[PDB]
Amino acid sequence: PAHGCRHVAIIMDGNGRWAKKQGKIRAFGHKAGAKSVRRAVSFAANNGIEALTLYAFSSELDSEVKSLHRHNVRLRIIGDTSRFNSRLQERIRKSEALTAGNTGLTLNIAANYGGRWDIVQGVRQLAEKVQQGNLQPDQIDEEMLNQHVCMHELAPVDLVIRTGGEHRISNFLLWQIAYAELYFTDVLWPDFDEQDFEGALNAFANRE
Amino acid sequence: GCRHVAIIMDGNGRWAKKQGKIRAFGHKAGAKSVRRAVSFAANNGIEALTLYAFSSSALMELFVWALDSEVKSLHRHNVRLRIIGDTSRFNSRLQERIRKSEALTAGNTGLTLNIAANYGGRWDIVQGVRQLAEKVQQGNLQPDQIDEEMLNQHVCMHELAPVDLVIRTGGEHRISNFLLWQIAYAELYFTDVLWPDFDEQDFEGALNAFANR
Numbered sequence: 001p002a003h004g005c006r007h008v009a010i011i012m013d014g015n016g017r018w019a020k021k022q023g024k025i026r027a028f029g030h031k032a033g034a035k036s037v038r039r040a041v042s043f044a045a046n047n048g049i050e051a052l053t054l055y056a057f058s059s060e061l062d063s064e065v066k067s068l069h070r071h072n073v074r075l076r077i078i079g080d081t082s083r084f085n086s087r088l089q090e091r092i093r094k095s096e097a098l099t100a101g102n103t104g105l106t107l108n109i110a111a112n113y114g115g116r117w118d119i120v121q122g123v124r125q126l127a128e129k130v131q132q133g134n135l136q137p138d139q140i141d142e143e144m145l146n147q148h149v150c151m152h153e154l155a156p157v158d159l160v161i162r163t164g165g166e167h168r169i170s171n172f173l174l175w176q177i178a179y180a181e182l183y184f185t186d187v188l189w190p191d192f193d194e195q196d197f198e199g200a201l202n203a204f205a206n207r208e
Numbered sequence: 209g210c211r212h213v214a215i216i217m218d219g220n221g222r223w224a225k226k227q228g229k230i231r232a233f234g235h236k237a238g239a240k241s242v243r244r245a246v247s248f249a250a251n252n253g254i255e256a257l258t259l260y261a262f263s264s265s266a267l268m269e270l271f272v273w274a275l276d277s278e279v280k281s282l283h284r285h286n287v288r289l290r291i292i293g294d295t296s297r298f299n300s301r302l303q304e305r306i307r308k309s310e311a312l313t314a315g316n317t318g319l320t321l322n323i324a325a326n327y328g329g330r331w332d333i334v335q336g337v338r339q340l341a342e343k344v345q346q347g348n349l350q351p352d353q354i355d356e357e358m359l360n361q362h363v364c365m366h367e368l369a370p371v372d373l374v375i376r377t378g379g380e381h382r383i384s385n386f387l388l389w390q391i392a393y394a395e396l397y398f399t400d401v402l403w404p405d406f407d408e409q410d411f412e413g414a415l416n417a418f419a420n421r
């Protein structure tokens with residue numbers, strides 16, 4: 001649409017600092033952070049973004065899925081969930097199945113996600129195909145590896161936002177950001193609101 | 209303590225026009241800015257400097273000409289030179305020059321200067337993946353033995369200090385498929401200064417940005 005941005009990824013940071021400046025404990029910053037997440041999700045949905053990928057950075061989802069479904073949002077959980085107990089994982093997949101048919105915003109939430117791991121699990125899949133006498137090491141190119149990293153079915157990440165002041169990727173997406181616009185703001189996550197998100201989108205629109 | 213700096217050199221052509229001169233003038237000033245960044249890195253204890261020329265046969269002979277004229281001086285300055293990237297299709301004479309220039313300076317112990325030539329971050333990761341696919345196909349590697357540490361041993365520069373800081377001049381705010389795996393934890397510094405103008409003062413500012421942060 002107008003801003004030209006189809007997929008936005010956000011490294012959410014700053015809740016702790018935000019609460020501390022208030023003189024409140026971490027829990028307070030967490031409640032504020034979740035409010036800021038709903039706000040960013042509403043904003044993305046109301047603005048034609050096809051996909052929003054969120055990453056909670058730490059210098060250290062069952063109630064929501066319904067409101068999500070009710071808002072026609074499609075939900076996916078990216079990250080190494082292979083170790084969680086089998087209950088969670090089902091609970092995760094249920095939430096996923098449940099919204100797979102929604103046509104609005106596709107929301108990706110990182111849980112135990114790493115860009116290096118993401119690349120490695122994809123490598124493992126190709127390795128498995130090798131061991132099966134189906135794939136020749138020399139047939140493996142970029143495109144093929146690309147079909148195996150998280151979110152390869154969605155539009156490429158156009159813009160990555162990191163709030164909170166740090167200027168680093170911190171092992172969030174790596175393969176996927178090869179061409180993304182990188183936008184860093186000192187604003188703390190709890191205070192990152194619609195006008196901040198719009199500012200980031202207009203920065204992307206005028207930059208490209 | 210910044211040990212390995214990587215720079216996305218951008219802005220020469222745009223610089224050219226602001227002067228109202230041709231692209232060749234910008235290239236000329238860009239090469240001078242390269243010598244100055246390399247000199248500066250070596251004078252200030254930086255362990256590795258990795259350079260990537262961003263662009264929107266000739267250059268092949270230019271590469272050969274550059275290596276032929278500058279290696280002797282890198283050598284005297286105790287700099288170890290490495291080219292990173294797919295040089296598999298460069299003509300054989302340039303391939304041989306690159307090999308000899310690397311061989312000649314391989315034992316130097318000062319600054320390691322990595323010049324990216326036809327390099328891409330994705331290609332780089334895929335090159336590593338192909339190597340592992342071989343070991344797997346042979347039966348010496350199990351698909352689930354493959355891990356981050358293992359993959360890392362097969363990406364460019366894995367023998368060097370980890371990239372601490374990535375500088376991109378020229379105004380754009382993207383990695384443009386330069387280093388990807390290697391920048392997982394690096395500080396990313398963007399400046400609108402055009403490459404020909406990037407000098408000792410701009411370089412230090414980036415280093416400070418790293419120090420304070």
Ligand SMILES: O=P(O)(O)C(O)(Cc1cccc(-c2cccc(NS(=O)(=O)c3ccc4ccccc4c3)c2)c1)P(=O)(O)O
Binds near residue numbers: 110
């Ligand atoms: O901002 P910080 O780094 O100071 C901190 O609040 C961690 C944090 C960073 C960014 C956002 C949030 C935040 C708090 C609560 C909810 C949300 N997002 S969320 O509801 O989708 C969610 C929260 C935490 C998660 C942890 C691991 C996987 C998925 C998560 C999803 C964001 C918390 P902290 O715990 O390290 O003080």
Ligand SMILES: O=P(O)(O)C(O)(Cc1cccc(-c2cccc(NS(=O)(=O)c3ccc4ccccc4c3)c2)c1)P(=O)(O)O
Binds near residue numbers: 041067068071
């Ligand atoms: O609620 P609406 O439809 O009235 C509106 O907010 C638009 C809107 C569109 C799509 C979704 C939402 C929405 C509102 C509030 C919260 C949410 N999602 S959320 O922030 O609670 C959330 C989503 C996924 C999560 C996964 C794991 C942990 C926490 C999560 C929180 C979605 C709102 P609006 O701007 O039209 O008034």
Ligand SMILES: O=P(O)(O)C(O)(Cc1cccc(-c2cccc(NS(=O)(=O)c3ccc4ccccc4c3)c2)c1)P(=O)(O)O
Binds near residue numbers: 219231263
């Ligand atoms: O900046 P741009 O994108 O406007 C453009 O100049 C392309 C460009 C981008 C970045 C750097 C350069 C540039 C051009 C030519 C050479 C150099 N560096 S270099 O290859 O001469 C080099 C420098 C020092 C070396 C020392 C020892 C061995 C090899 C060396 C090679 C940089 C050009 P353009 O032609 O696409 O407009």
